[PDB]
Tab-separated table of C-alpha atoms in Angstrom:
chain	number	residue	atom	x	y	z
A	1	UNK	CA	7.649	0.208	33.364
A	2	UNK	CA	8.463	-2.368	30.650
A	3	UNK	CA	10.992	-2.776	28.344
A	4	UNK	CA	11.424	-5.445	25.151
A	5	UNK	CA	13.829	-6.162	22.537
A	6	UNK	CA	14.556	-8.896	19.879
A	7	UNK	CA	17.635	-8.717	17.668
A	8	UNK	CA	17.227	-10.143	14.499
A	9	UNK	CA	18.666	-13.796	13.699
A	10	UNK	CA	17.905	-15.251	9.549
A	11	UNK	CA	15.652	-17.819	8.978
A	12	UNK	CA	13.304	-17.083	12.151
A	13	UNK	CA	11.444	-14.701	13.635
A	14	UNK	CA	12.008	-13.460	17.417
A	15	UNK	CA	9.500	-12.243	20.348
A	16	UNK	CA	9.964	-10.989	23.634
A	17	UNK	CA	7.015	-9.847	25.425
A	18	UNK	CA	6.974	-8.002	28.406
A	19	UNK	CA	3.399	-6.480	29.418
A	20	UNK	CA	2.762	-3.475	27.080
A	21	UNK	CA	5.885	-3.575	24.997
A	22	UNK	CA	6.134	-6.088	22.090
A	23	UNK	CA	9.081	-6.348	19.965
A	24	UNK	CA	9.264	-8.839	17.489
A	25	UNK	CA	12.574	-8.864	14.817
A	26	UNK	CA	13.547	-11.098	11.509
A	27	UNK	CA	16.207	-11.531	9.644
A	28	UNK	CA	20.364	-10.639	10.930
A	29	UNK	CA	20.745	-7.054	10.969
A	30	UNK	CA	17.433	-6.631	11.881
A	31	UNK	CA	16.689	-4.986	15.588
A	32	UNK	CA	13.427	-3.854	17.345
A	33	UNK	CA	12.716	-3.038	20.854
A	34	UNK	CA	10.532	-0.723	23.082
A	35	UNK	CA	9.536	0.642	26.349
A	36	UNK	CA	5.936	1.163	27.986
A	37	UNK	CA	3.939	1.702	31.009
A	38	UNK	CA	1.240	-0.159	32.278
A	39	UNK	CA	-1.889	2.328	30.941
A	40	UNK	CA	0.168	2.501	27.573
A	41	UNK	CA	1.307	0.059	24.480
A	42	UNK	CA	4.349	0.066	22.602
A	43	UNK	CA	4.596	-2.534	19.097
A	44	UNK	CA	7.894	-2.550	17.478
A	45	UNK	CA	8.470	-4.992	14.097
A	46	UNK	CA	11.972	-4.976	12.473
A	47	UNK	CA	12.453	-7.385	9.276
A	48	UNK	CA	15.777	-7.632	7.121
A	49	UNK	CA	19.522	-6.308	7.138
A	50	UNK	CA	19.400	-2.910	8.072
A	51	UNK	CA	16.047	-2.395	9.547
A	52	UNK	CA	15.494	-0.802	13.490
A	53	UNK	CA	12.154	-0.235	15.069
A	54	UNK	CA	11.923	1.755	18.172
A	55	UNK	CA	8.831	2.392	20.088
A	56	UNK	CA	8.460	4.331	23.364
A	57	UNK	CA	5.273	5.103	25.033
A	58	UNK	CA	3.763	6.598	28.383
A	59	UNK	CA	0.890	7.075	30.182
A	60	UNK	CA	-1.862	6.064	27.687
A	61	UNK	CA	0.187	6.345	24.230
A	62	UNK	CA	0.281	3.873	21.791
A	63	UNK	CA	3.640	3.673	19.870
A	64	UNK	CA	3.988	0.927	16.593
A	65	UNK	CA	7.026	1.126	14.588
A	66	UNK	CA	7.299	-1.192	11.435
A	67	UNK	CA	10.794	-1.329	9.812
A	68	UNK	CA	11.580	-3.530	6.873
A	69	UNK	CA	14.491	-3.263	4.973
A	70	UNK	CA	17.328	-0.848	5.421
A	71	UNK	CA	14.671	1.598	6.984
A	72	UNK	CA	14.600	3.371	10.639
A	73	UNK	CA	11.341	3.646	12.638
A	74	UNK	CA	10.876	5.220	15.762
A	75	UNK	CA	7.379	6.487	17.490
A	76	UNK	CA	7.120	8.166	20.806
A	77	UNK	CA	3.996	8.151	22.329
A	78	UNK	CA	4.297	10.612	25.408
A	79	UNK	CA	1.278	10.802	27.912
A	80	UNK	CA	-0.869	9.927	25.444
A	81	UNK	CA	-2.117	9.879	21.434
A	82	UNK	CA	-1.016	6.954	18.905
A	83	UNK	CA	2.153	7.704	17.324
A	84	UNK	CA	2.931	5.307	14.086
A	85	UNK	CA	5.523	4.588	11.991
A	86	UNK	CA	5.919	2.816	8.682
A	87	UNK	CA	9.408	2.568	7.575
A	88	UNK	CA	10.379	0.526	4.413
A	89	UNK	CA	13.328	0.536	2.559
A	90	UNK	CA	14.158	-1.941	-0.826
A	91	UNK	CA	16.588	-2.496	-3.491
A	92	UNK	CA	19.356	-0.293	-1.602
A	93	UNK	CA	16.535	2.790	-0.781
A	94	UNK	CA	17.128	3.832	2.768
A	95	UNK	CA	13.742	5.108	5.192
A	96	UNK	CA	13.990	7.199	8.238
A	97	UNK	CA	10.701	7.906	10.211
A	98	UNK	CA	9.755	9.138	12.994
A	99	UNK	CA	6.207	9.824	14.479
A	100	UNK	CA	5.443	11.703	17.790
A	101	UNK	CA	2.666	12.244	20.259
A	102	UNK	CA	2.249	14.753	22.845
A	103	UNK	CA	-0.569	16.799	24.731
A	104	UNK	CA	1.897	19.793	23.806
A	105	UNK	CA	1.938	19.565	20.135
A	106	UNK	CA	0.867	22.325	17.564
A	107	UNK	CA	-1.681	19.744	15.911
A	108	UNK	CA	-4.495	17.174	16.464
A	109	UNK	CA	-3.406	15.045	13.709
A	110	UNK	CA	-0.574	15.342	11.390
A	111	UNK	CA	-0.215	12.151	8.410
A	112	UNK	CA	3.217	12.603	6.605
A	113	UNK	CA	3.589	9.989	3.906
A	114	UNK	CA	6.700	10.314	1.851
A	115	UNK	CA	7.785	7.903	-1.395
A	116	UNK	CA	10.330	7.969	-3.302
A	117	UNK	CA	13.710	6.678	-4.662
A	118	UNK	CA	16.996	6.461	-2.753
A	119	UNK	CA	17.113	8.147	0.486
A	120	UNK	CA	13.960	9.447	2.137
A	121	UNK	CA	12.935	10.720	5.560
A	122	UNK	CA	9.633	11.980	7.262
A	123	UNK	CA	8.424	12.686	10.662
A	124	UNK	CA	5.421	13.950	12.348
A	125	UNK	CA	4.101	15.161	15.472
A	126	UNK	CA	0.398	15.994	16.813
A	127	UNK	CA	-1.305	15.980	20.589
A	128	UNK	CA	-3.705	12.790	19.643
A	129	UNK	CA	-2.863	11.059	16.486
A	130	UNK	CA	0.958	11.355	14.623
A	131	UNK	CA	1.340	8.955	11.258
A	132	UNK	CA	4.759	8.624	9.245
A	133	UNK	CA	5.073	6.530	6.533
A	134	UNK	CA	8.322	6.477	4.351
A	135	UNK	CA	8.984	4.211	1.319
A	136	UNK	CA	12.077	4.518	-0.290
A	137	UNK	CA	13.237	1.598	-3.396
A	138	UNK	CA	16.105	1.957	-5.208
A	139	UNK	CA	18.723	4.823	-5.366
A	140	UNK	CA	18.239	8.469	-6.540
A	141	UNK	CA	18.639	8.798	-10.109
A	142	UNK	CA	22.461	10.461	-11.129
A	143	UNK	CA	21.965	13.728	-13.470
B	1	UNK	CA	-19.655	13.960	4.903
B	2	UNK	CA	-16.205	14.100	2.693
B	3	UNK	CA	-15.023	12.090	-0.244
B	4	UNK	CA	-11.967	12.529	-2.424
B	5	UNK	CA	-10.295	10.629	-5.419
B	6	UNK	CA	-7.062	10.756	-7.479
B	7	UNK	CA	-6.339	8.680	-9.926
B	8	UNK	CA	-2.586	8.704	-11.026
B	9	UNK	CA	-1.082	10.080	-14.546
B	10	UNK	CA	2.161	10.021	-16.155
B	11	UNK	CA	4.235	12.796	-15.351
B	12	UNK	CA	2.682	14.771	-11.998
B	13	UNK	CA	1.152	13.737	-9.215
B	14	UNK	CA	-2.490	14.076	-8.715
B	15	UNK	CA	-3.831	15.877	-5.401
B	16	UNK	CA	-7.289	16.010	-4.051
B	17	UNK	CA	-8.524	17.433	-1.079
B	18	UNK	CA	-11.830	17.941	0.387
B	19	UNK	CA	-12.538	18.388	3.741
B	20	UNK	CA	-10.954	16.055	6.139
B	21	UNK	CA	-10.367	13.974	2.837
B	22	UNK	CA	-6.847	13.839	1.354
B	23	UNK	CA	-5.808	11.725	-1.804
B	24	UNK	CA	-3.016	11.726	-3.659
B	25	UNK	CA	-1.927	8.859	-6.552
B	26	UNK	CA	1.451	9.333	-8.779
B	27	UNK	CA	1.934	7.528	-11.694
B	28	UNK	CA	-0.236	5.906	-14.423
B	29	UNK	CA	-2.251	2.903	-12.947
B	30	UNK	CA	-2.561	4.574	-9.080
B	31	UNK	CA	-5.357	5.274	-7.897
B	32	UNK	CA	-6.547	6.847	-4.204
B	33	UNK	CA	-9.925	7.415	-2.385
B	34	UNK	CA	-11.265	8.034	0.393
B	35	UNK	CA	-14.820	9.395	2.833
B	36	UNK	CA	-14.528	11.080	5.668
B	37	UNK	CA	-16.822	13.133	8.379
B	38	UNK	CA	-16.015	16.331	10.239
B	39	UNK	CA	-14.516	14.985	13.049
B	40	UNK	CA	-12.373	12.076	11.295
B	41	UNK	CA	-9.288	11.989	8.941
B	42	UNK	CA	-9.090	9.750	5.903
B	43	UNK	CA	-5.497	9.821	4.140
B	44	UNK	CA	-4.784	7.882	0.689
B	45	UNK	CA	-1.763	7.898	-1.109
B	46	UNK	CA	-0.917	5.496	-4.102
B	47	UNK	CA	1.973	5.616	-5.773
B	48	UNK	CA	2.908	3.690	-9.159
B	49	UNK	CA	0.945	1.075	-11.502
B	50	UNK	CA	-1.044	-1.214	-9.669
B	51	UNK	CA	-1.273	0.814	-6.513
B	52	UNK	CA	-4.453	1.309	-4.916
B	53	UNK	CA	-5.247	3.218	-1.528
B	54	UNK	CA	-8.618	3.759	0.071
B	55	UNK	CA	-9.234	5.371	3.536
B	56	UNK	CA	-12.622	5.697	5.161
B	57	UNK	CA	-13.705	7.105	8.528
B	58	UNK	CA	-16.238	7.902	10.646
B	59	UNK	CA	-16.740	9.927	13.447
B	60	UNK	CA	-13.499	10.614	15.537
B	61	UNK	CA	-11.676	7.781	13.500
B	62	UNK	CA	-8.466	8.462	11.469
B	63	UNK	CA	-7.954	6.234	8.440
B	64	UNK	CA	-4.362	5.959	6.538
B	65	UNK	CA	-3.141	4.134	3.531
B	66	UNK	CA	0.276	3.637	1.542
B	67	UNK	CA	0.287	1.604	-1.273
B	68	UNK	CA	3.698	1.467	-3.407
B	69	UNK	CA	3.434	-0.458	-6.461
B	70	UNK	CA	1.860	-3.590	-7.123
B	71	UNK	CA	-0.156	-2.944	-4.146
B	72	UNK	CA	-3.681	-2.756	-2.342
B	73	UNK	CA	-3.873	-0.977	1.028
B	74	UNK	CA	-7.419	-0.360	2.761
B	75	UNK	CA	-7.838	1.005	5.845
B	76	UNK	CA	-11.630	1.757	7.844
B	77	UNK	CA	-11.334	3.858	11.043
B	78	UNK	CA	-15.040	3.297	11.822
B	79	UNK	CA	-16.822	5.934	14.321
B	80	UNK	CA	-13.076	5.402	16.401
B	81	UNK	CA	-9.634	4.818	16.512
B	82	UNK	CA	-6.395	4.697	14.145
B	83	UNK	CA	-6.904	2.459	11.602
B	84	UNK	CA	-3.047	2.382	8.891
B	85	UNK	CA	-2.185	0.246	6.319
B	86	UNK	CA	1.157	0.314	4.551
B	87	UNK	CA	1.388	-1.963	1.280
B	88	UNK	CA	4.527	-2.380	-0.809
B	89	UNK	CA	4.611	-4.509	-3.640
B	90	UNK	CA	7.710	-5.205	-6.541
B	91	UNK	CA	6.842	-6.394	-9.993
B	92	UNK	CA	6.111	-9.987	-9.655
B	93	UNK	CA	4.694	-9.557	-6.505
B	94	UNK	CA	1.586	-8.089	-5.062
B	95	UNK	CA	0.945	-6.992	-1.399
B	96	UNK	CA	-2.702	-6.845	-0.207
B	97	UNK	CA	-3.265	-5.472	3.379
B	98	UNK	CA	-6.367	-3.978	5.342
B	99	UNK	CA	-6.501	-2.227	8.712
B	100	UNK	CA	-10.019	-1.861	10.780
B	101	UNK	CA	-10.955	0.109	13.998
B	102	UNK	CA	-14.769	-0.672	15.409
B	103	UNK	CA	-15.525	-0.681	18.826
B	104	UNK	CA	-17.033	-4.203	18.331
B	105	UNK	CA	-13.465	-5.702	18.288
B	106	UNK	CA	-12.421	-7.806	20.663
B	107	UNK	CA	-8.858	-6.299	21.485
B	108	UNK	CA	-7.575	-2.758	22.078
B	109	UNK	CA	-4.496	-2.655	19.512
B	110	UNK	CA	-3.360	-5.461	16.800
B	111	UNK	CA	-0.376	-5.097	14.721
B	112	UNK	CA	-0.163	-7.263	11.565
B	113	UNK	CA	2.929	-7.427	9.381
B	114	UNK	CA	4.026	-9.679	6.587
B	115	UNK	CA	6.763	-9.967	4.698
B	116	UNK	CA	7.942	-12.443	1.266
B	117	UNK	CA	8.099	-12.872	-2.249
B	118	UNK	CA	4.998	-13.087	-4.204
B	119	UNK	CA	1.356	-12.831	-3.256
B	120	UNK	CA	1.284	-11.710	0.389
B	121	UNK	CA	-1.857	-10.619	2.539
B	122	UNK	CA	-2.740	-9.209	6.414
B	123	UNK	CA	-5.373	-8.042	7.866
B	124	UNK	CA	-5.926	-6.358	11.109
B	125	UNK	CA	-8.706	-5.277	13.389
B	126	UNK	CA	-9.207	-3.440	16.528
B	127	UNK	CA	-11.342	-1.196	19.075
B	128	UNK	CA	-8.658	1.482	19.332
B	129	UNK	CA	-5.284	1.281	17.103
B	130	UNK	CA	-5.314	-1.448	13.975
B	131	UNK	CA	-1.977	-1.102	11.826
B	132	UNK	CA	-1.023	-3.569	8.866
B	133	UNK	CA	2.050	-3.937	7.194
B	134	UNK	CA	2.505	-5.673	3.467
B	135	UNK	CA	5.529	-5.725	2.093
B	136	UNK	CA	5.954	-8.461	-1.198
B	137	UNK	CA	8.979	-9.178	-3.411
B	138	UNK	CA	9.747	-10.847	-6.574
């Protein structure tokens, strides 16, 4: 197997390659990394304080995570299917995502796409294609 | 084949769903769309003014967008693969992104992801998993 990870530094971007896994991270407070297998590809993108992207993949998954902002993304690609993440977070809104693969899951295909203000989560699972997208901006409103 | 189309209002969102077509568009100024076949997935959500989503696919592909304000995401899953594109975009800014799966690309997977003030584009294109990431600030 192969694992990558680039911590985040301001002003530059950061790359480690090894085979399958690619992490790539901008900004301080800003983290990505990833693990893979030969057959299978793992992407993970972190940019800004606050933002992680963890991708894990085996056998022939494909895991991408994209975190920007204070936002979490992690996609777990296990055996095989393409499990994607999309977590963005601005203005003080915080994203958690997660996305899943598995020959065992209840689903083909399962898209959750959540936006909103303040905190917001979403995950997903499916056997062959799993897609999370969260977008959170700005804070809940106060009643 | 599918299509579907919302196009955003004040005060609800607007859902529609045909077949292996899903759109969705919130807000005044969003708009959604999609096509789709029997064996692919199109997804399109749009969310506030200026946001505009469209998904098509063909044959096993599954196309998703996300497009959050000022904000154009496209994304073509042709005949194959996961095509998703995720564009975010604050007033003053405007994110543009586009994610393509063919199996006349030349790689197996490209990621694309941008990230600034202002007007801010990628574009991304693969045989079997194309994702894009805009994000733009002001």
């Amino acid at each position: 197997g192969y694992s990558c990870r680039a911590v985040g530094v301001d002003g530059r971007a950061v790359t480690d390659i090894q085979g399958t896994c690619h992490a790539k991270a901008t900004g301080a407070g800003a983290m990505a990394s990833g693990t893979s297998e030969p057959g299978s590809t793992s992407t993970a993108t972190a940019t800004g304080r606050g933002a992680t992207a963890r991708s894990t993949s085996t056998g022939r998954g494909t895991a991408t995570t994209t975190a920007t902002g204070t936002a979490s993304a992690t996609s777990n690609a296990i055996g095989q299917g393409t499990a994607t993440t999309t977590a963005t977070g601005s203005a003080g809104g915080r994203a958690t995502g997660s996305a899943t693969t598995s020959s065992s899951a209840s689903q083909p295909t399962q898209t959750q796409t959540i936006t909103g203000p303040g905190f917001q989560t979403a995950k997903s699972f499916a056997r062959n294609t799993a897609t999370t997208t969260v977008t959170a901006s700005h804070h809940h409103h106060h009643h």
